[PDB]
C-alpha cells in the first residue's frame, strides 16, 4: 500500500520511498546528487542510480551521518528469482545483516565484506506482498566514499550459491528505520 517514487534526475534513476512521508525530507540534486535527512518514526529508502542495474562499478562520495538504525548501501532488486541485494558499505546501531545465515566472505575494494543471506516472508516487494531472498556483503571497515565492484559482489555470491536473476534497478540506497540522520551523497561511474 505504499509505493515509492521513482524517476529521473541529474541523469540518474532515482528511486524513494517512505511510509512516513512528514518524517523524512527527500532532495535531489544536480548530477548524481541527493539528499536525504529523517528523524522519528518511519522506514525510508532513497537513492539515484540506473535502471537495470548490471555488473557495473560504482563511484560514490559525500557525508553519512546515521543516527539509530541506518545504513549506506549499493542496493537493488532482480526478478526470476526475485531477490534484494545489499552491498553495505555503511551503517550506523544496527547491522543490517543481522540474523542472515553468513555464507562466505569476500575481499574487494580495500576491505572485507562478510556475506550473508536472509529470507523475508509475506514482505513488501517491487513485485508487493511476497516472499523473497535478501543477499548481504557487509562491509568490515565503513566508509562514506570510493567506488564499488557490483560485478565482484555478484560473482562471490555466485560462488556460494547465492545465483541473481535478472536485474531491475540499481541505486546507491541511504536508509532509516525509526531513527534519526542524514546524507549528502553524490554517485559517479
Ligand atoms: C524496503 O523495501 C521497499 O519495499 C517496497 C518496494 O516498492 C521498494 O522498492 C523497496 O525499497
Not at 559525500?62 to 541506518?70: E, K, L, Q, R, T
Not at 568490515?140 to 534497478?169: C, E, I, P
Request: no cysteine.
Amino acid at each position: 500500500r505504499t509505493q515509492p517514487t521513482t524517476g529521473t534526475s541529474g541523469g540518474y534513476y532515482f528511486s524513494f520511498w517512505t511510509d512516513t512521508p512528514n518524517s523524512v525530507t527527500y532532495t535531489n540534486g544536480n548530477g548524481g546528487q541527493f539528499s536525504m535527512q529523517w528523524s522519528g518514526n518511519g522506514n525510508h529508502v532513497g537513492g539515484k542510480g540506473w535502471m537495470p542495474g548490471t555488473s557495473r562499478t560504482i563511484k560514490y562520495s559525500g557525508s553519512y551521518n546515521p543516527n539509530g538504525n541506518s545504513y549506506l548501501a549499493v542496493y537493488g532488486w532482480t526478478r526470476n528469482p526475485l531477490i534484494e541485494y545489499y552491498i553495505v558499505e555503511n551503517f550506523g546501531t544496527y547491522n543490517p545483516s543481522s540474523g542472515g545465515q553468513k555464507k562466505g566472505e569476500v575481499n574487494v575494494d580495500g576491505s572485507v565484506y562478510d556475506i550473508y543471506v536472509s529470507t523475508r516472508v509475506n514482505a513488501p516487494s517491487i513485485d508487493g506482498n511476497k516472499t523473497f531472498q535478501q543477499y548481504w556483503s557487509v562491509r568490515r571497515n565503513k566508509r562514506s566514499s570510493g567506488s564499488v565492484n557490483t560485478g565482484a559482489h555478484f560473482q562471490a555470491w555466485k560462488n556460494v550459491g547465492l545465483n541473481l536473476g535478472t536485474h531491475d534497478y540499481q541505486i546507491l540506497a541511504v536508509e532509516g528505520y525509526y531513527s534519526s540522520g542524514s546524507a549528502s551523497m553524490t554517485v559517479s561511474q
